[PDB]
Design a protein around this ligand. Structure first.
Ligand code: CYC
Ligand code: CYC
Ligand code: CYC
Ligand code: CYC
Ligand code: CYC
Ligand code: CYC
Ligand code: CYC
Ligand code: CYC
Ligand code: CYC
Lengths: 160, 161, 92, 48, 49, 173, 160, 161, 161, 161, 160, 160
């Protein structure tokens, strides 16, 4: 979160928190009412955000679901959508934490080692998160879509 | 190293579920006290040297640990104290902002009582210094903010015991 | 934080290299020097090139320049490649 | 008398190298598998 | 920088056990400080245990 | 470390009092033998490379096992010349730090720089403690051969070597 | 010299010389000329002494003089006295600057690899200096030879 | 860190005797299998990533250590596994060439089970991963070579237990 | 304190599932060697004093730990050894019957290397005594039974290291 | 627990050699002072209560550790002192007879400073009590005998510091 | 002392002590008779050296004793002279140790942290030691006053 | 020794040493001159006391040296006499310590476990010490033979 790494920043520097750090912990907690509303929208829209998320993913990447693709059959396609439910969950954590620190140490650190070791095309799962982003930002206003989309594209950046 | 939001996200994540009404219920409780903690951490940063000067003069200034033979006699040993008391007043400020005492045992408590026994530092006088330091901290930040900052002082005193 | 907290003589941390570098300083030099080891003939370690040219930061040029002469080095040229001069704010 | 103790772990000091030995150790030291040359390196000594 | 092992350098008798502990992968989990207590108990009397 | 003087001054600081005359009598006993403590030290520098050589032959003449194969106990005695080279090196140290400690008039330099971890180090390499202590006092008799007609230099020379002997012992009694 | 050791040893701690060190300079400078008077005594006996050094280094070690040894031949023995001359010249430097650095920055540091690349047996050179110290006692009285005695056996300690 | 030749020389040297008929008898036995070990270490180097991918998918891929709360949930934690399993398949390759498991406890086994207990890594799932990794290694190198490479896997599993 | 059957039941129970074909597959493997382990534990009980007398005379009988100053000089100290070596040969017999080394670290290994460092007992000579004791144990029980009893000796030597 | 003769025999035994001239040279030095130590231990046994009554009245009788709040206030706490000071005057008598301070750290010093820190006993006032107790002990036994008995008092004060 | 740091100097350098180090341990122990006489003068003059020491300190720094000064009242003024009794004691240790090593690790290392943390003006306590120095050197001859004053001004240097 | 266990006796009882304890430490140290003479007799008679000790031991116990005996051959017979040299040494310690405390914790505590675990007949080694006792007491007067023999028979008692 912004609270924990604004601390560990000033922790390492042998000092307390500046006004630049304490006027933002202050500014973040007054932002906390609006953050829970945004995460509350994505919380009980996972049925559509995931299922329509895998909608565009297969239309854009039919190789991964075609015979020979990693997510082929009734089995892998279920797990094919399971990971999108994971990453959609971590974005709800990042929105409430005000940072990608929850998304950092979960689903991002060493993610290329996992998916390379699973045979999954890491570029394909990046395409899946982008398809979820258009569904997510379509569910919110412009002021919110600059945030909810904002955490997806960070996940897109670290996932390639 | 988790704050109240990190601990709430961890417990809600460790079961693989979303942030339900109970998880957000505590998060709203933390955001309500977000205004109180910064002002508490504000004045403590200002009066850091004054608080430590008040605690040592009120608890262990004239006791015979201060005199020859006591545990605090030489100037290197005296100077180590206010250096040492600065961490307790500083890390307690971090716990007061993060709303979670995980940083204390992560960075202060572990190997601490095992270290003072090595040096021969009196744990009894140490806790009373922190207790007196907790008493002056309630003076500055007020009652409820002192209740918050005081809640992490005795956490140090408990584990250091 | 920075190296000028109030430390001087008679202070608890030992008297050492005190640099006039601000918080997270972003000035760095480009130095050039030879520094013969003067200790290989009783240690018999492998040999390394002593003529180096490298970018040292402003935060630790003084310590390095104070140390390069400690072991008989000679400084052939130094410059301030990155950073301003007489700049009150902005060295961070 | 010494009033403390760091422990004495079982240490085997080196004695010599062998052709079978050191290039099992060089590729070990880099944290990489045996390479074709240093593993063909292990071979033609055991054919001697 | 390399790790100055036992068969590298003339070692010293005072931190024999600790340095062999520190040159192991188990080093980053002794969360209790191993060396500052050991160098200080060298001077103080026997501890209670 | 601490010499006889600084060890005496810490004795009076812990009690926080000035130096009385019993304190100064301890310092004067160092200043009297201080001039005698040097040619003991100066004789060692002139006799250093020799005095290790007589100690080794006097040692292995009684411990021929130390120059032999170890047995299946992988033990570090002077088996190989690599073992013999390092093993003579330890006799360097015992003569050296017992040479400073003759000048300091106090065994403070001994235990913190020689004794601390000595049983640690030898238990790792399986080194002989028995023969290791016996060579320490072969040096003591060898050094006392030079100063022998009187007997007040003898107590000075004996104090460092005797301290390593009592301290490297697993206590039988 | 001795003042150089105090300026250096006080310079790595970033402090002026303490009370004890300024004794060590003051006592050294008050014993100044007696080193100066002593070195003129030894310089007038360099042809004195090295002739006596070649007495006993070769009656002790006829291996080196004989045909096959390193010192066999005229010109090999010619520099042989020169090495005594440089060593005796170095000791006059060490007797003056009251410490071991002129015997250590020259002569001692790396002496074995010099001789080992020359064929001179390094054990023989130790007896050569021990022979040289044995020769200096005869042309010097009891007062001042123990002043110069510790400067010789440092060389023997340095060569082993 | 001794191979079969180093261990034979050590035991023959530690008694101060020459290499008699019994010491050379084992050395000839090691040189006979010298051709088998290199080809075993050859294919294992080629299929290092494929073997580890086969073991985790066959032993602990879908178990609930893989799911949230399990010991392998986060991507840092999953990535540490295949990093961790790489050492077991790598150091076992070294033991297979050296013909002596001294390198394993020297560089792998010591402080290993004491480290997993600190992190809370499940030793039970770890051994079954190595057992499954041993099963696929017998596929590649053959039967007897799998018997050789397999002889050091369970050595890791035994000491790690 | 689990045997092979206890460890198989625990892992099959800890997932809440029944004993499938893989769990019973190892159990059948343990029952096949049940006849070998008893005869191995039979002869070891008979020749307990003879095995320990053979190990100490073959490893550390005449070394200078046996002489004055060595770690085994006084008769109390010598008598503690054969008392001490009896546990290693005894508890290894228990691991050979139970087919699981859990009893060793439960009752032998924990606080063992930390205890020998306190007393100053040489861990190097201790392991070679157990190695020599492992060598004679393979003499009595045979090859494969020695492989079984030997598999727990080095487990003690590994953890004690 | 070694006397001067035990320590001399140990060092002469630990090298496996006989009692040479240097070992017997110190033993003769101990037997010369054997007459002095008994008379020193004689009068100390007689005036045990008088010496402790003199030390506490001369060092810490009227200081504010004696008053309320001080470390010695309650009668149980005061009575523990003279019980506690009796051991220092008693064990120092044992060291004076044995001629070796091994009994002190064996039975007094170990876990002592670590115990006073637990109770919160002031080590500064403790050493000055022993210093004052050392001062009166030199009154009774004389100068050189006081030098002997005094040599073990500051040994307690040094290690207790 | 000079004995302990001449050892730890040569200790770190893996060598024994040079003539420069052993002719000064020798020169220091013959100086030991004269050192105890000097320390014996300051030992039972602490009544005048301290009380007249605080004499000039207040007549030069009336702020520290005036109402508001750190040493104000009957209480602090007693402790105001207590520290001077401390530093006068450490100078007696430095004279007998032949170095400020006793004064270094007692009353000098981290002294600015203590007095800054006590609210005491560190410059004021430096003025107190200078006033003691004029009283101390007035009690001894010129040969001694170059020593007893010599340790005070080192304490003056480190105390600012 | 008598000094160390007269202390640890009065140590446990929370008291000092009585006249009964201090008139015997006194009586023991005046006895110390006569003890060193007695131990000095056995010190350089170990060649005869041991070799004649094993003399009567084999004549009285030929089984232990006969083929099948524990001390059979050139090897074991050398160690067969080695133990007698041990126990003869411990008796010299007990005579100088004035007690069997040195003999107690060396060669007596747990001795039956060692010799039973070595296959040695413990009764046989007891016969060896008795043969040494007649040789030892034959070397001394009646006043001494009541001591030197006195420590052997204690070793005989504890060794069965
Ligand atoms: C919270 C962060 C996080 C992630 C992301 C995660 C992923 C993860 N993905 C897995 C499998 C899988 N993942 C896929 C995924 C895909 N196939 C495709 O074609 C697509 C490109 C892609 C999905 C959009 C497939 C097919 C498997 C099964 C592979 C197999 O059975 O071999 C598995 C193994 C089975 C399991 O335990 O679920 C894990 C652990 N774990 C985590 O903790
Ligand atoms: C951030 C968590 C943390 C803590 C708390 C910490 C403590 C710590 N306290 C120390 C010493 C010390 N601490 C004290 C403290 C005291 N004396 C008293 O009488 C009082 C009861 C007490 C003051 C409240 C003293 C006197 C020393 C010096 C001991 C010595 O020189 O032997 C030392 C030794 C090294 C040094 O100070 O440079 C450490 C490492 N380290 C850490 O990382
Ligand atoms: C031991 C030999 C030696 C010297 C002399 C030395 C000088 C030196 N002076 C510096 C800066 C400086 N020096 C000054 C000095 C001055 N400003 C003025 O107006 C005056 C004319 C002058 C004082 C007399 C200032 C203001 C800086 C800071 C410059 C900056 O922040 O840009 C720096 C940059 C780093 C730092 O201070 O930490 C070095 C390295 N280094 C050495 O190793
Ligand atoms: C300053 C105090 C001090 C001491 C004494 C010291 C000893 C010391 N002795 C060593 C080895 C050794 N020491 C010996 C010595 C002996 N072998 C015998 O059989 C004899 C009993 C004995 C000679 C008297 C041998 C053989 C080794 C090498 C062991 C091996 O590699 O096999 C080593 C490991 C190699 C190294 O130096 O890095 C150390 C550190 N270190 C210290 O700091
Ligand atoms: C200032 C310190 C210093 C020294 C000592 C020094 C020595 C030195 N000795 C040399 C040769 C030599 N030195 C010797 C010496 C000896 N034969 C004996 O029997 C003797 C024991 C010994 C002379 C006392 C011999 C025989 C050679 C010729 C070897 C050859 O070239 O075949 C050489 C090659 C060139 C030359 O002779 O000048 C150097 C440089 N250089 C230095 O800078
Ligand atoms: C060369 C010998 C050697 C080994 C073996 C070794 C292991 C080792 N494994 C680690 C962690 C780990 N190991 C695992 C492993 C697993 N999780 C599971 O569920 C499985 C049972 C298992 C994979 C088989 C995980 C998840 C971590 C991360 C733990 C954490 O972040 O808390 C760590 C912590 C630091 C890091 O990974 O950077 C070390 C040091 N170090 C060594 O030097
Ligand atoms: C069941 C698991 C277990 C073990 C293993 C164990 C060991 C143990 N070994 C001990 C001592 C000892 N152990 C030894 C052993 C040895 N000396 C050597 O040189 C050899 C290397 C080694 C024989 C192999 C000796 C000599 C002592 C006595 C130490 C002393 O008196 O200081 C002691 C001290 C108390 C006593 O023996 O009564 C314990 C508790 N306790 C346990 O509960
Ligand atoms: C041996 C080295 C050493 C020193 C120097 C030392 C100083 C020291 N000075 C103290 C107090 C004090 N010191 C002063 C001193 C002064 N007021 C003035 O105006 C003057 C400028 C100055 C004296 C010349 C005062 C007023 C206090 C009491 C402060 C208070 O009560 O808050 C205290 C706290 C009370 C005590 O335990 O005595 C210590 C520990 N301790 C040491 O171990
Ligand atoms: C100081 C107290 C003390 C004693 C007594 C002692 C005895 C001792 N006796 C031993 C052997 C032995 N001892 C004997 C003794 C005998 N054979 C006979 O027939 C006779 C009855 C008897 C002698 C009079 C034999 C034959 C061996 C060798 C046994 C073997 O090789 O298996 C050994 C093993 C080898 C060795 O290290 O010397 C020890 C340790 N150690 C001690 O520390």
């Amino acid at each position: 979160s912004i609270v924990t790494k604004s601390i560990v920043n000033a922790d390492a520097e042998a000092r307390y928190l500046s006004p630049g750090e304490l006027d933002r912990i202050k500014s973040f907690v007054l932002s906390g009412q609006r953050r829970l509303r945004i995460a509350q929208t994505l919380t009980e829209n996972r049925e559509r955000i995931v299922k329509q998320g895998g909608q565009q993913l297969f239309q854009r990447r039919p190789d991964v679901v075609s015979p020979g693709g990693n997510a082929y059959g009734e089995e892998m396609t279920a797990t094919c959508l399971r990971d999108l439910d994971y990453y959609l969950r971590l974005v709800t954590y990042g929105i409430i934490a005000g940072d990608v620190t929850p998304i950092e140490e979960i689903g991002l650190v060493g993610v290329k080692e996992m998916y390379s070791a699973l045979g999954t095309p890491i570029s394909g799962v990046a395409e899946g998160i982008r398809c979820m982003k258009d569904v997510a930002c379509s569910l919110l206003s412009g002021e919110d879509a600059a945030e909810v989309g904002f955490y997806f594209d960070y996940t897109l950046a670290a996932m390639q | 190293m988790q704050d109240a939001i990190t601990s709430v996200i961890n417990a809600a994540d460790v079961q693989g579920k979303y942030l339900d009404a109970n998880s957000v219920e505590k998060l709203r409780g933390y955001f309500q006290t977000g205004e109180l903690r910064v002002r508490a951490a504000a004045t403590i940063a200002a009066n850091a040297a004054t608080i430590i000067k008040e605690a040592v003069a009120k608890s262990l200034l004239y006791s015979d640990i201060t005199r020859p033979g006591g545990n605090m006699y030489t100037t290197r040993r005296y100077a180590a104290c206010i250096r040492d008391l600065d961490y307790y007043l500083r890390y307690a400020t971090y716990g007061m902002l993060a709303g979670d005492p995980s940083i204390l045992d992560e960075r202060v408590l572990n190997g601490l009582k095992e270290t003072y026994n090595s040096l021969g530092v009196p744990i009894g006088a140490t806790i009373q210094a922190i207790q007196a330091m907790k008493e002056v901290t309630g003076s500055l930040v007020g009652s409820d903010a002192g209740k918050e900052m005081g809640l992490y002082f005795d956490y140090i005193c408990s584990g250091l015991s | 934080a920075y190296d000028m907290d109030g430390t001087g003589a008679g202070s608890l941390e030992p008297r050492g290299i005190k640099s006039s570098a601000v918080e997270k300083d972003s000035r760095c030099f480009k130095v050039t020097f030879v520094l013969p080891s003067q200790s290989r003939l009783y240690t018999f370690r492998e040999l390394q090139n002593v003529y180096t040219t490298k970018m040292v930061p402003f935060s630790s040029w003084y310590a390095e320049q104070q140390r390069i002469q400690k072991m008989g080095g000679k400084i052939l040229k130094v410059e301030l490649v990155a950073g301003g001069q007489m700049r009150s704010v902005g060295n961070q | 008398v010494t009033k403390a103790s760091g422990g004495s772990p079982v240490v085997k000091p080196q004695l010599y190298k062998t052709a079978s030995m050191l290039t099992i150790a060089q590729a070990e030291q880099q944290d990489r598998f045996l390479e074709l040359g240093e593993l063909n390196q292990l071979v033609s000594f055991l054919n001697t | 920088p390399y790790i100055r092992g036992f068969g590298e350098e003339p070692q010293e008798c005072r931190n024999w056990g600790t340095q062999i502990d520190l040159f192991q992968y188990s080093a980053p989990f002794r969360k209790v400080p191993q060396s500052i207590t050991l160098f200080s108990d060298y001077l103080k009397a026997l501890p209670d245990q | 470390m601490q010499d006889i003087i600084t060890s005496v001054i810490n004795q009076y600081d812990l009690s926080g009092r000035y130096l009385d005359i019993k304190g100064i009598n301890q310092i004067n006993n160092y200043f009297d033998t201080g001039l005698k403590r040097l040619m003991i030290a100066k004789l060692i520098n002139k006799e250093a490379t020799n005095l290790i050589k007589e100690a080794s032959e006097l040692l292995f003449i009684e411990q021929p096992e130390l120059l032999r194969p170890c047995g299946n106990a992988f033990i570090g005695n002077a088996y190989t010349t690599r073992r013999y080279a390092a093993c003579i090196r330890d006799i360097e140290y015992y003569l050296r730090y017992s040479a400073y400690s003759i000048i300091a008039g106090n065994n403070s330099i001994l235990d913190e720089r020689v004794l601390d971890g000595l049983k640690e180090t030898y238990n790792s390499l399986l080194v002989p403690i028995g023969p290791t202590i016996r060579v320490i006092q072969l040096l003591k008799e060898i050094i006392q051969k030079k100063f022998s007609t009187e007997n007040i230099e003898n107590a000075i020379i004996a104090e460092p070597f005797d301290y390593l002997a009592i301290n490297l012992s697993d206590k039988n009694l | 010299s001795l003042v150089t050791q105090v300026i250096l040893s006080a310079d790595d701690e970033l402090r002026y010389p303490t009370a004890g060190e300024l004794e060590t300079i003051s006592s050294y400078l008050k014993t100044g000329e007696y080193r100066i008077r002593l070195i003129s005594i030894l310089q007038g006996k360099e042809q004195e002494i090295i002739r006596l050094a070649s007495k006993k280094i070769f009656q002790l070690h006829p291996e080196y003089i004989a045909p096959g040894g390193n010192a066999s031949g005229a010109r090999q023995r010619a520099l042989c006295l020169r090495d005594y001359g440089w060593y005796l010249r170095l000791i006059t430097y060490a007797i003056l600057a009251g410490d071991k650095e002129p015997l250590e920055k020259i002569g001692i540091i790396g002496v074995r690899e010099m001789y080992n690349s020359l064929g001179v047996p390094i054990i023989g050179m130790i007896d050569a200096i021990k022979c040289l110290k044995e020769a200096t006692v005869e042309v010097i009285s009891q007062e001042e030879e123990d002043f110069v005695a510790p400067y010789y056996d440092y060389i023997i300690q340095g060569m082993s």
